[PDB]
Amino acid sequence: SDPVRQYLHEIGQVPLLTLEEEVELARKVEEGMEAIKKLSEITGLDPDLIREVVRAKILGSARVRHIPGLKETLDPKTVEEIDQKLKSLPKEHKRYLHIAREGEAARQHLIEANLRLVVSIAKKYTGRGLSFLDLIQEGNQGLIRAVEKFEYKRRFKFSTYATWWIRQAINRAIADQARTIRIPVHMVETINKLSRTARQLQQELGREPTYEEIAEAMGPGWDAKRVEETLKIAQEPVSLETPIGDEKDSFYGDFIPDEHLPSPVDAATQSLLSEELEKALSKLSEREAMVLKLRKGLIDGREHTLEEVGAFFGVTRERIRQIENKALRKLKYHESRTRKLRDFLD
Template identity: 65%
Template sequence: IGLMKAVDKFEYRRGYKFSTYATWWIRQAITRAIADQARTIRIPVHMIETINKLIRTSRQLVQELGREPTSEEIAKRMDIPVAKVRKVLKIAQEPISLETPIGEEEDSHLGDFIEDRGVVSPAEAVINVNLKDQTSQVLRTLTPREEKVIKMRFGLEDGSEHTLEEVGQSFAVTRERIRQIEAKALRKLRHPSRSRKLRAFIDGVRD
């Protein structure tokens, strides 16, 4: 609900990160929901799905239009009546308890559908492992020195990115020499024979 509010109010031109902006709205929505425990509303599963779809559609339109989409534009993209969009937006912006029953059986609660961002999902874990393996395979096609330089520069070994000077000290060469090695390695990595192995992961992130 807070995320829906953030999507509705977010203005990217101000230069703020959406994640930072959304956090405030989400926290506010949760606070209001806790304060309003007595006012429990049962939400059908299909309505939760519609709210989620509307959030995704609104986010896409913001990126495409460079501004907040109107209810009419959202309705046209989702192929649903404008009145339904307005109804969903109204529901999404109301304070709702995290203990709100979901579905006809009422055996689940709204809180069960809120993702824990602090925990890596199984799908994300698999993607990360595969990406790491593919990256290692691609880097092994470089010379040992080029591979080491790229790993140090981009923190692929210990998670810490090193400066040209730090890498140069490791190889006992000048920072300019490291810059040249890095540039050559990056040109190699941009070649289709190597870059296509990682393209699927990049496209997946963009989607």
Template identity: 60%
Template sequence: MSLSAPCRASGPSEYRKVGAMQDHDSHDSRLLHELLTDVSGPQASELDELEHPPQDELGLRVSFIEEEHPPEEEAHPHEEAKAEKAVPISDPVHAYLRAIGAIPLLKGDEELRIARAMGEPGEAGQRARGRMIEANLRLVVSVAKKYLGRGLSFLDLIQEGNLGLIRAVEKFDYTRGYKFSTYATWWIRQAITRALADKARTIRIPVHLVETINRLRAISQRLTQRLGRKPSDEEIAAEANVPVEKIADIKKIVKDTISLETPIGKEEDSRLGDFIIDREAPGPASAVASLLLQEEIRALLGSLSDRERQVVELRFGIVDGNVHTLEEIGRIFGVTRERVRQIEGKALAKLKHEMSERRMIEYIE
């Protein structure tokens, strides 16, 4: 994904090349508004929790509905440089990380000065916004790596996170007293989780439900820290002021899908689908009987004249599954419908006699 024009204009040449290489038709400014304009922004309590995460004295890893999806911690600048080593990366991602690694980070006073300048009109504000975006691209990488393995590639996660970063720059208000990285982390997560809900799942989760899931995860985290154990569905429901049945429903929704092509066994020579019974499929005995019946039908049709066989095949859809009327068959052969009826009757009489001779009734039963 290429970022905004201000970001590209002020970035190093290598970064601009990487941005152009990663451009996707579906990741443009229009998508940003489709995904994010209906989000009002973080509440003060959410920003406080990001900027000053509660200490878990028991050292518990908090879990909500899916234990494999622990809540993310805020990404700090000094951790961002570790992202490249923490995950397996492809050459395009490696080039991207190398490019953004050359962009200097902002110090506290410099960040505040640029944050103030972002609100200025014209080119000055544009340059400030571009500088703030570029200085926080590593923050996006740090947040994005926490969502690996959920259906989107690392590069796609970074692209979606960059959309959230742009939105954060557009809406940041330095007078509220929060660090930009705190505010941006919230928007980056919003963009990534919405993209995962919209694109990654086989069964799509509506965006509004994703926000409900995230809210319940946060409630579960607070309850775990308060109670010193994993909260029950009833406790989460009471804290969230929702019916307990809704918690159970959401548990079912967030369960990950698994491909029937998933390898099974040490040698991975089998697939999960091989061990799932298709209850609609015929059993071995029925399949063999059906095959024998088809062979007998072909032999029976061979006892008819060419015209009789063609009429029967068309009337009963034996060849292509399409059943034809007497009128349609008459037009095909250039005869009346009554003549077709006579040919059909004669052919069926022959077949009935042949069936009794061959004792085919057992196949039909």
């Protein structure tokens, strides 16, 4: 029923490792990687392309997908094909295909074994924009990192080394998907700075600080202006469906006009202009009301300075610029009788 007690139960099935099984699995994973590029420079294929094939066969054909980064599409034909020039090796070279396979198999039991640890870390990064499970999965995600980077020979327990990548990966998710407006992980980092320093200022003053009382305690390069515009981008949006009233028959979104699409006044105001100016071109001359009807656009606009003006108008380059003045001139006298244009300047 409850999708957390569920996962809390699957986890509770894989037993916890003991010190030997810890170092056993860790050891096998290390050796198996070594095995994989020893296995690569023998056959000369590619460590990763080889690693995925070890990976497929251990987990079953249940899963295989063309892995981004590999150059060929890893379909079950190339996994039999390539598992073949693999098992084709001498017992002292194909020695290592058994090493890899053993490694991948220990990779798993070492991840699966240490999931209860992730839980006990994500548990305390709650209420930060991401849900428990979302946090767990991210936590897990880092755990995977931890095994491909563990060094059993340093003698540390596994808990210790992984508790780094785990929180390293929660914290990157809390800071990369929480906000509806994604803000670079470092800006997020400095924002939290203002928050925490403002908080101590308030705990010191007995009132919330001003902008400047922050720019000071924030140090140098920090002025009041720069704390302010940092806060307004820090600003999280709000729901169009937020409730307006204690009943629920109005949405905050309902009181919001649609500025984009033209209103019917405007819609109409545009069509009457763009023809009562066509009602001032065919009034004195329609080929001088056409070369300056092409010094801009009736639609699309056509206006540069001197270059296509010089290509196809019929006339020379600075003669179209003169009937440009007289086309305009005539309209400025033309538009002392049909004075139905002033209104359009608002």
